[PDB]
Structure 1
Amino acid sequence: KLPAEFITRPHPSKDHGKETCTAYIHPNVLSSLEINPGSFCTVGKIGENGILVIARAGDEEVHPVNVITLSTTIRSVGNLILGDRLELKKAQVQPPYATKVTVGSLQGYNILECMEEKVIQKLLDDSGVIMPGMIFQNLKTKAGDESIDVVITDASDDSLPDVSQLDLNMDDMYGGLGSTHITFSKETQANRKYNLPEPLSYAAVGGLDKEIESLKSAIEIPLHQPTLFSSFGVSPPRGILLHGPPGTGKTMLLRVVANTSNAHVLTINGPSIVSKYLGETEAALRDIFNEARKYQPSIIFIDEIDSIAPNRANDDSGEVESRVVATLLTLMDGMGAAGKVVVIAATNRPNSVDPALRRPGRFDQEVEIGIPDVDARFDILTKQFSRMSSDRHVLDSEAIKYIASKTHGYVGADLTALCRESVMKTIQRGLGTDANIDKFSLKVTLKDVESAMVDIRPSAMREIFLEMPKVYWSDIGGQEELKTKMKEMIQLPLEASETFARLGISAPKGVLLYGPPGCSKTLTAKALATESGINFLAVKGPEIFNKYVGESERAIREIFRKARSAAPSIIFFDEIDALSPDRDGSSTSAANHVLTSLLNEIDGVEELKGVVIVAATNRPDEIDAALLRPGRLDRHIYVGPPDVNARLEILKKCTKKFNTEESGVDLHELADRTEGYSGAEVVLLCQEAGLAAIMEDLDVAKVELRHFEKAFKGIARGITPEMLSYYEEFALRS
């Protein structure tokens, strides 16, 4: 009596029953709306007018008023998720007549003629039947079993009222155990012209597998098999935390688990629950938890837990505050013993979440969703293009790989936005040039994608997870001794952890790279990342410095936690000659605090086995003796200027584009004359020599020796023997 809102529940007892028009609503509500039992009922689900015209019936006086049942077929057709709010309404005009109907054979190769066996009678024998959406189980179809479903979205009938979402009609068939101009034609999927909300499948998300299988296991073990875990007596966890940069797709995980799960779920509206009355929010939360526990399979979804649950230490806002945190933890600690209940909470930043929620008592299980790497970006672009299809755009694998390589610091949302505004750029180009031609002819190419990266205005530039592009050995021309040394250093831990454990030697976990400001000490990290195939943490020196006091400590602790959590890896520092000096040069107390924290983290009380830390510096004396202590950063590499062979290889690679035979240079006398330079200096010399070659008559097929020698006058090495002697003296004392 006097109803306000309704909730959904699948029709039990399976089989057939009604399967379309169950509608087990309490008779009081039926008499309240003055609706004929032998007439259609309409439920709107808070919006989306059309109100889902479906016939109704009466219950057995046991079904409570709040909950209603409207069949799994309609549940899947309308993308109805168990827990959404539903609102009833008066029925509209009667549906006239159905014209064509046509099956689609979803997720299958069709060819059902052998297994057809007159499915038309079974499909259209049901009462009601709103044509564009039906979905039924495979049931039993002769031999072979298997699972088959069809798509019935396509239609050609016209309806005067545009209010109705799926424009149902009337069915009049003739059969036993005559149609309308057959139904079987083509294997089309859901038609786009109806703009229906399609369900989200796990195939939509790409490049996020490694944690998505873990999340699937963690959400399936409490629900599907609660008794197996409860037999141990430790009880299954109830809280799963999803964290990461914005746009990674936590909302996607929430939506896809809501869609793929046949059990009831409960979602929150966030700030909407917050009200002026202190007790109103408490009562709403208690009612939500009571509803969740009443239905034995339940799942709780929380959006923006940080806003709902801010930190007490950071801000004492008052009113709606950690009181709700205390009541939530009290309710969720002893809501049930075994049950099957899992709570999923997604936060933008984990640090701002109060430590009460971030305790193993409630949210021990955590899921880390970082920014996509090159492989994940390639996977999402390959998946992203598939949705558009080859008809809408001609893109090959090489273009996808090039885009993934170019797009380094881009979030998943940024990629989809780039695709959308690439389509926009295509529309403007077509309208401007072809004078309103069909948009399918121009389709999508790389020309608009280039301008897309040009004007995308990215938002993920500032991050501590910068990964340099993969660079192979052939690019780097250096000394074989240093390469052998670093190969041994990287090969010791990965395939000798057991040997270290048996012997007790462990690993030095510290390598110092000091040398002239030339080359071979920065791109060697990229070469190492390419060769080893292990994720690297390319963290620049000055970027960790922040105006706010303690922000650098937060960043370094977060990066250490990520390195520990991201398997045995290697962390590379671009420069350390700026943070390390505290006594030689005047520095703030923040720098000293950060240095002390780094010293305590590297080998202070806590020793890390899997991770390996390598430090590169441009000036060695800036590292204090506290950091330059035996047991840490013991290895020292001179990594001086490149030798004759290294410079020759660099020059050969630089001149590979040009023609050496036409120029007549043997690539040896140039290296003999270019001995005091560096690899980067050689690259710049070749660049300016090519510029001098091309400024004469635009494009040229070769660079001449006269241009080489003129550029040799033009440029200077800029390196003095005094700094080399100083580096040698430092190497002697080490």
Structure 2
Amino acid sequence: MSILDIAGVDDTLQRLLKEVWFPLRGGEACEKMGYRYDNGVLLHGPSGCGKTTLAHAIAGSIGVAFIPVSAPSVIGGTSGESEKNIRDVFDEAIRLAPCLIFLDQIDAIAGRRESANKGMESRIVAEIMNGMDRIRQNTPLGKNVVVLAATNRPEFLDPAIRRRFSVEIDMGMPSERAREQILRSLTRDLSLADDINFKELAKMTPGYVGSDLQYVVKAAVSESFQANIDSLLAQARAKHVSQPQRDWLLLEAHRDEEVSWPSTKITMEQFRKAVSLVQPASKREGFSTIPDTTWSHVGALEDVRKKLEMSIIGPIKNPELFTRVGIKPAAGILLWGPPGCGKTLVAKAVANESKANFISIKGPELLNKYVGESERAVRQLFSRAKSSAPCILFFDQMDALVPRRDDSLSDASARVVNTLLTELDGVGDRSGIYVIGATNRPDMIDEAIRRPGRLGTSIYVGLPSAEDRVKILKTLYRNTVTTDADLEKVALDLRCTGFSGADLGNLMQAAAQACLERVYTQRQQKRKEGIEPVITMEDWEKALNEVKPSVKDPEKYMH
């Protein structure tokens, strides 16, 4: 199916009112001018964007003869049967004019014949051209035939067939306003709890298509009936191998008895839980899992945290506020400094606190041995990020992916640098893509990469001060379990001079090992002759005399 079953597309439905409805339903108007209005409409877009449902929705809204055709169904085993089946499709449409043909998945049979290394395949393409031309000529005046074709790979079509479609409609991924309309059309026959905020649901589904939104509704429905299965398991558990295995066995036993499920409404909490259970089709591959690191894991670094909130977390959460002042929805951050001071840690909190999509690149991970496959990976990297905006791209140890372009530089590694130059700031737009780079050698990064629009801001993450080492040590200790007065003394000790965040974590590890040695020796004495492993202040003394700083030349990275 029905015109209400298709939603989120309004420009598309406006065109089809004069390119599909008018030729088929306004037949008399065309006959006044003596004009043969035989039209051909090609629908293309991402898979799941309601191309098949749009064709069937508008095929019941017109009422003319409709011929649904699937491309594999017109293939036969006989020598001439395959081409005869296609011929009968267009012959029946002329006999039933006005009529609407839907050639779904037309790219399966109408592929390029320069690469279709067969005889049937080339004659199938030629038969479609002849069929689409008989419609324009063999139909009576005033009885037009419209051919609808849907394919998510329009580039595979033969150019001699693609030119026969006067109208091409690109059904892209739904926008935020469009996703709200689709959700309403999917839940219009369900019983909702009157508190469903479709504005919030559309805002929390940045990279979803119509099929993905159907899964959210499908997942939310199962939430409502989840409580009606626990009540069913209670009737079976109390009637008479882990718990999940018992459920599959108790329900198997009562395979001849059924209990009516009470009708329930779907609340807003179920919908918000359903969104988390559904992964978008565009998120199936290429995306990393969100790190568990939060701001509670990051001690000190208040200056760094404030810069990352204004540059990334801010515009992601409320882009409306940042748009008014004139800030583009795209940031490029270069974190640099001595090793172990929290560059990767603070970039995993941003990936987690912003609640956006995350892709992490491990240095030169995109390099490939073939000529074009390393630059293609970079181009594909920004295609997935753009399609699932907002997204955070994190390049860990980025100096290995964008080395400074010199004569001595390899030609193959200079193409990757120039590929990233165009992806970050070129002709195409990367709005909604936020890039974070972490490196120890900011001077080994190409100077064109380090410019506003590609990586505008450089944030220096250096060695902690004496006051900062207290915040870091408390953060490390409380996230792994002495009190706090002793931690201040341990962190402020002159033996901790030059310690980084990784050294304080190593200092705590050396304190725990000293605790275990103390436990080992005392346990034997109080078991043979005659406990609780807890890090005492005496254990911290052993660690302070054992752990040495790791950044031995701080000024080598401070430059």
Provide TM-score, normalisation by structure 2: 0.60
d(CA) in 2 for partners of 1:529 and 1:237? Answer: 46
Within the candidate set 528, 546, 558, 2:380 is matched to 558
Q: CA deviation at 1:351?
A: 7.7
State the one-letter code of the partner of 2:151: A
What amino acid maps onto 1:222 in structure 2? L
1:725 counterpart residue number: 555
Number of aligned positions between the proteins: 456
Match of 1:344 in 2: 150
Task: State how 1:74-93 maps to structure 2 within 5 Å.
Answer: none
1:704 aligns with 2:536: yes
Match of 1:591 among 404, 409, 413: 413
Structure-2 change in CA distance of 1:284 and 1:372 (3 Å): same
Aligned equivalent of 2:183: none
Contact 1:274–1:320 (CA under 8 A) maintained in structure 2 = no
**Superposition pairs for residues 188-587 of structure 1, below 5 Å?**
213-214=7-8, 218=12, 222=16, 238-243=41-46, 262=60, 264=66, 266-268=68-70, 270=72, 273=75, 277=79, 280-291=81-92, 294=96, 298=100, 300=102, 302-303=104-105, 308=109, 317-321=117-121, 324=124, 328=128, 342-346=148-152, 363-368=168-173, 379=216, 382-383=219-220, 385-386=222-223, 389-392=226-229, 463-469=285-291, 471-490=293-312, 494=319, 495-497=321-323, 499-500=325-326, 510-567=332-389, 570-581=392-403
SS of residue paired to 1:238: strand
User: 1:352, 1:217 → 2: CA distance?
Assistant: 26
2:489 to 648, 651, 669: 669
Identity across aligned pairs (percent)?
A: 32
- Alignment CA distance shift 1:462-1:225 (3 Å): closer
After TM superposition, give the deviation of residue 668 of structure 1 in Å.
0.9
Gap regions ≥5 residues in structure 1: 1-80, 83-200, 203-211, 396-423, 441-458, 730-734
Q: Please give the per-residue CA displacement for 1:471-513, whole angstroms capped at 9, x wherever unaligned.
A: 5433322422223333343458944556559xxxx79954322
Counterpart for residue 275 of structure 2 = none
Once the two structures are TM-superposed, the CA of residue 636 in structure 1 deviates from its matched residue by 2.0
Tell me how large the CA RMSD over aligned residues is: 5.7
Give the distance between the partners of 2:17 and 2:449, measured in 1 at CA.
51
Q: Report the Cα offset of residue 430 of structure 1.
A: 7.3
Higher-Rg structure is 1
What is the SS of the residue equivalent to 2:305? helix
Determine the structure 2 residue equivalent to 1:165: none
CA shift in 2, pair 1:227/1:431, >3 Å: closer
CA contact (8 A) 1:478 1:643 kept: no
CA shift at 1:365, angstroms? Answer: 1.2
Cα deviations by residue, 1:612-650 (Å, 9 ceiling, x for unpaired): 544333432332344346764342222223444554334
Gap regions ≥5 residues in structure 2: 31-36, 137-142, 175-205, 233-240, 257-280, 524-530
Give the secondary-structure state (helix, strand or coil) at the position aligned to 2:334. strand
Change (3 A) 1:678 1:544: same
Structure 1 residues 301 and 466: alpha-carbon distance in aligned structure 2, compared to 1, 3 A threshold: farther
Whether 1:615 aligns to 2:420 is no
CA contact under 8 A between 1:513 and 1:637: conserved in structure 2? yes
| Cα distance in 1, alignment partners of residues 438 and 52 from structure 2 | 42
Letter in 1 for 2:334: L
AA aligned to 1:390 is A
Q: Do the aligned partners of 1:464 and 1:539 also contact (CA within 8 Å) in 2?
A: no
CA–CA distance in structure 2, aligned partners of residues 431 and 498 of structure 1 = 56
- SS of alignment partner, residue 552 of structure 1: helix
Amino acid in structure 1 at the alignment position of 2:412: A
Question: Which residue of structure 1 aligns with residue 201 of structure 2?
Answer: none
SS in 2 for 1:512: strand
3-state DSSP of counterpart to 1:655: helix
Is residue 222–residue 342 contact of structure 1 (8 Å, CA) maintained in 2?
A: no
Change (3 A) 1:580 1:361: farther
Q: 1:702 to 1:389 in 2, by over 3 A?
A: same
| Alignment partners' CA distance in 2, 1:519 and 1:355 | 57
Q: CA offsets, 1:675-704, max 9 Å, x none? A: 533334444554565576578489957432
Cα distance in 1 for partners of 2:243, 2:99 equals 48
Alpha-carbon separation, structure 2, partners of 1:520 and 1:243? 40
Distance 1:237 1:680, change over 3 A: farther
- Is contact 1:515–1:640 with CA below 8 Å preserved after alignment? yes
- The answer (yes or no) to whether the contact 1:577–1:623 under 8 Å persists in 2 is yes
Contact 1:223–1:341 under 8 Å retained in 2: no
Q: Is the 8 A contact 1:466 1:539 kept in 2?
A: no
**Counterpart contact for 2:334–2:459, Cα < 8 Å:** yes
Distance apart, 1:576 and its partner CA: 1.9
Change (3 A) 1:470 1:261: farther
CA distance in 1, matches of 2:415, 2:58: 49
Contact 2:43–2:149 (Cα < 8 Å) also in 1: yes
Contact 2:93 2:100 in 1 (8 A): yes
Aligned in 2, Cα 1:215/1:492: closer, same or farther, shift over 3 Å?
closer
Distance 1:227 1:460 in 2: 33
Paired with 1:334 and 1:570, the residues of 2 have a C-alpha distance of 53
- Which amino acid counterpart does residue 705 of structure 1 have in structure 2? M
TM value normalised by structure 1: 0.48
Between the aligned partners of 1:275 and 1:216, the Cα distance in structure 2 is 43
